[PDB]
Write a protein that binds this ligand. Structure first.
Ligand SMILES: [Mg+2]
Ligand SMILES: [Mg+2]
Ligand SMILES: [Mg+2]
Ligand SMILES: [Mg+2]
Ligand SMILES: [Mg+2]
Ligand SMILES: [Mg+2]
Ligand SMILES: [Zn+2]
Lengths: 96, 81, 126, 114, 60, 141
RNA sequence: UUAGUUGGGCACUCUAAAGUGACUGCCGGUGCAAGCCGGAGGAAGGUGGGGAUGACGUCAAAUCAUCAUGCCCCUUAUGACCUGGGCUACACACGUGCUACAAUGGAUAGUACAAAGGGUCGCGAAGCCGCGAGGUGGAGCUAAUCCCAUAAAACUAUUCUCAGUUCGGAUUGUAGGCUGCAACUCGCCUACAUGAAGCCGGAAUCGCUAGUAAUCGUGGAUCAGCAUGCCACGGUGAAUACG
RNA sequence: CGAAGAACCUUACCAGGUCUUGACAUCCUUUGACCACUCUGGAGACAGAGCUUUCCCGGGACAAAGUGACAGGUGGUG
């Protein structure tokens, strides 16, 4: 009855980190859900390409987030410890 | 202020005008305040209001209560081209 | 319960067919209370008249996204899909009628320096 | 008719809108103080009805008196010599509004070329 | 100018309404994005360089 | 394009699309339906037949093209494409139906199709005038 | 159950990772060939649609005011602080746009269907007071949970009956509300009243080939507040291309 | 169009009132918490006083005053 939310900018890192968590979590307690994908909330920053003039010519920069959610269904102190010890490839954010 | 929570007037002007009850109106009060309202208590005592380059006199009346001081001290001098 | 999905613009219709007389619900409402126009209602019919299956089945619909005409297009699309589902021998009829053509006309981007997708400002030399 | 010879064909609301000082919502309020039907026409009125409407009107501010009132207000800030009244006297916008361009209903029609 | 202005930015004003944003790199006031705190042109530089996390070039 | 849902004609859908203003297909389509209802009221017969007769009356054959010939620009006549034929018919119909000046749009359109099936109206004056100028300038063919 | 509510289940959507597929790959015609035209299948057919992606160099094009920077100049002032003012001026000209000039419409009521987005000292609910702008209140929310957020055009009914009009909405007067120490110069919004010009635009001139043009609303940034501007969003949805 | 926000600030311009190792940095010398809050004269900057500045383990970090080297220029030339 405890939940993990993983959110980052890189879906490959994030997917693999979630698979890591899920395999370790199945080792430390068998009954756990899979990771579930959420929508990619994002921000498109639109900038003048030039310096002085040229309002008409621009460049656009998309900051996406990718994020997955996990639900543990039968915790053990082994599971809590395996998640309390474990540090992930940074660039991500774990939330419990 | 546009709202019932007011009015507004600069403390540095209200205090001098209150002291100017014993002024006898021979003297004059300079202010760099154009944002402060006119209370009835300002009546009679000429105020020299700073337009940007000079202090321009205004004589207060019952009729110019409710307004600001800058309405009686223009900023931009213009003569019909 | 035969089933099909149908998509037009941003509209999504999960639609299903049962054998019946011809009654139709859309979002727990009357087809006439949801699509009052004869034009759009006939548009919905189009598969059922291209292949004579109107007086046979009931069309049961749920829809989200888009506007009324887009939802109509989605509905006819999913309907034609479920007609394939109940009978692949309706493939030739519905293909040659063009109902299986998922209308890929999506609404085009806006772009910078343009007041729309393609519109540009009023040009002036001087 | 009702302070001035309003239209006989217009409905009562629109008729009362043609009084300098009265518009559509004031008309609805007045006809509701009268309890009359607002959708009715003006030749189709009755005389006692009309007189009650006149009473409510004369409670409301008089037409010419409204003219005198606004003109007095303008005269006041013209005759003090405030900025706002210099604008009234010069014929320019009074609100905090731009005059390099788009000031026609104050300046007048397009003046001669400089 | 701009050094004295970048100073006067950082000390607290007389009234809090007088705040205004400036890119810490180059204290230009205009087009400074408070989410990054950068000005648009420095932002474009660093975003090219990949020194900003998660941002890339928006194709769509 | 496609035929009309109700009647078996693409002409109706095109006329709807050519009266349409800012995507208001519902308004246009409804008023054309009610306008055929009006002409059925005042005539009692096939709306398709009367609309066809009106077409056949407003439908030009000859039309001028502007061509540079001999150091100036002339009007040379030419037989119109079969598609531009109908296009010009429907265009003229809608434009006179707008500039007419009756009360309601369905009414204007219905009266114009009546006059057109009867060989009257501005829309037919237009065909006649186009023929007249092209025939005046048939020296250049 | 008032509510997809609660239970239950991922069927279907939706989400988003890895795959598939569309490559002239196949058939007919012609070409010698490259290729071209047609045909089939399929969702999609001919670089599917749209983007980003801008070669050597031209205009000694613009930028010493984003930044750095050589040279020169000021260096008890060409530097620095504070208040107040100006960048919003106004006889007049141009560009770009918003609003309209109305009956394919306006006023009033009821009422269906969107997408893309933002939110921590931020979004701010319900309920209430207020004609209204807003006030109060504090639920829920660090968010596919909750909010901003009734989407408006559309449709249905009633009215206005083609009129400078219930068009139009300026300008002005009075009174309100917010923001902010402060709204005169110089913000925005509301109420009442006023009701301007305008009854489809000279010579000329501009965008657009498809979900485009036109049209309607929405969101975001900047931002205390201040948009007809800018960038994205979906809704409706055409005409035409002889050449 | 720079301006993806000109009420003050922004803002570079103007008038007025003021300062000159300075609004902003390094190097030296003395010292160490520097300051914060109230009163008065002020348009405010700023001057007079008060209360009150706890530096931390010779070192570290930031600070007042002297002191010249230097600073600073949205001053110029795209
Ligand atoms: Mg600010
Ligand atoms: Mg040059
Ligand atoms: Mg300017
Ligand atoms: Mg071509
Ligand atoms: Mg150059
Ligand atoms: Mg230059
Ligand atoms: Zn910068």
């Amino acid at each position: 009855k405890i939940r993990i939310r993983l959110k980052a900018y890189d879906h490959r890192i994030l997917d693999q980190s979630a698979e890591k968590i899920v395999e370790t979590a199945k080792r430390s307690g068998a009954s756990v859900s899979g990771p579930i994908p959420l929508p990619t909330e994002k921000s498109i920053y639109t900038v003048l390409r030039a310096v002085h003039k040229y309002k008409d010519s621009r460049e656009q920069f998309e900051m996406r987030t990718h994020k997955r959610l996990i639900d543990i269904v039968n915790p053990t102190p082994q599971t809590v410890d395996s998640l309390m010890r474990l540090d992930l490839p940074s660039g991500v954010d774990i939330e419990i | 202020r546009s709202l019932k929570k007011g009015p507004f007037v600069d403390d540095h002007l209200m205090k001098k005008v209150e002291a100017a009850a014993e002024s006898e109106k021979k003297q004059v009060i300079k202010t760099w305040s154009r944002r402060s309202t006119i209370f009835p208590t300002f009546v009679g005592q000429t105020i020299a209001v700073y337009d940007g380059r000079k202090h321009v006199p205004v004589y207060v009346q019952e009729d110019m209560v409710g307004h600001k001081l800058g309405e009686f001290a223009p900023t931009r001098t213009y003569r019909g081209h | 319960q035969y089933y099909g999905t149908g998509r037009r613009k941003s509209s999504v219709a999960r639609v299903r067919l049962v054998p019946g007389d011809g009654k139709i619900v859309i979002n727990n409402r009357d087809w006439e209370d949801y699509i009052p126009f004869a034009a759009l209602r006939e548009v919905i019919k189009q598969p059922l008249v291209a292949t004579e299956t109107l007086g046979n089945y009931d069309v049961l619909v749920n829809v989200h996204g888009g506007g009324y005409t887009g939802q109509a297009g989605a509905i006819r699309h999913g309907v034609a899909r479920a007609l394939l589902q109940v009978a692949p021998e309706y493939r030739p009829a519905l293909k040659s009628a063009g109902l299986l053509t998922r209308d890929s006309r999506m609404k085009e981007r806006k772009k910078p320096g343009l007041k729309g997708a393609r519109r540009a400002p009023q040009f002036s030399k001087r | 008719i009702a302070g001035v010879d309003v239209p006989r064909e217009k409905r009562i609301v629109i008729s009362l809108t043609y009084i300098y000082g009265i518009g559509k919502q004031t008309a609805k309020e007045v006809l509701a103080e009268a309890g009359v039907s607002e959708d009715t026409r003006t030749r189709d009125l009755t005389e006692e009805e009309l007189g009650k409407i006149r009473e409510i009107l004369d409670r409301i501010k008089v037409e010419g008196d409204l003219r005198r009132e606004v003109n007095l207000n303008i005269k006041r800030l013209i005759e003090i010599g405030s900025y706002r009244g210099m604008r009234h006297r010069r014929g320019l916008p009074v609100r905090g509004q731009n005059t390099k361009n788009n000031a026609r209903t104050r300046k007048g029609p397009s003046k001669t070329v400089a | 100018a701009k050094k004295s202005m970048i100073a006067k930015q950082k000390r607290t004003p007389k009234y809090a309404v007088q705040a205004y944003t400036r890119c810490e790199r180059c204290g230009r006031p205009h087009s400074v994005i408070r989410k990054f705190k950068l000005c648009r042109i420095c932002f474009r530089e660093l975003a090219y360089k990949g020194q900003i996390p998660g941002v890339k070039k928006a194709s769509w | 394009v496609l035929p009309d849902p109700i009647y078996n004609s693409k002409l109706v859908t095109r006329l709807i699309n050519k009266m349409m203003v800012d995507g208001k297909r519902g308004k246009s389509q409804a008023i054309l339906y009610s306008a055929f209802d009006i002409i059925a009221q005042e005539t009692g017969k096939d709306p398709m037949e009367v609309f066809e007769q009106a077409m056949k009356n407003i439908m030009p054959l000859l039309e001028v093209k502007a061509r540079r010939v001999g150091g100036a620009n002339y009007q040379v006549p030419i037989e119109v494409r079969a598609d531009r034929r109908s296009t010009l018919g429907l265009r003229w119909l809608v434009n006179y139906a707008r500039l007419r000046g009756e009360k309601t749009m369905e009414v204007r359109v219905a009266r114009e199709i009546m006059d057109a099936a009867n060989n009257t109206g501005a829309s037919v004056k237009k065909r006649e005038d186009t023929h007249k100028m092209a025939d005046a300038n048939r020296a250049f063919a």
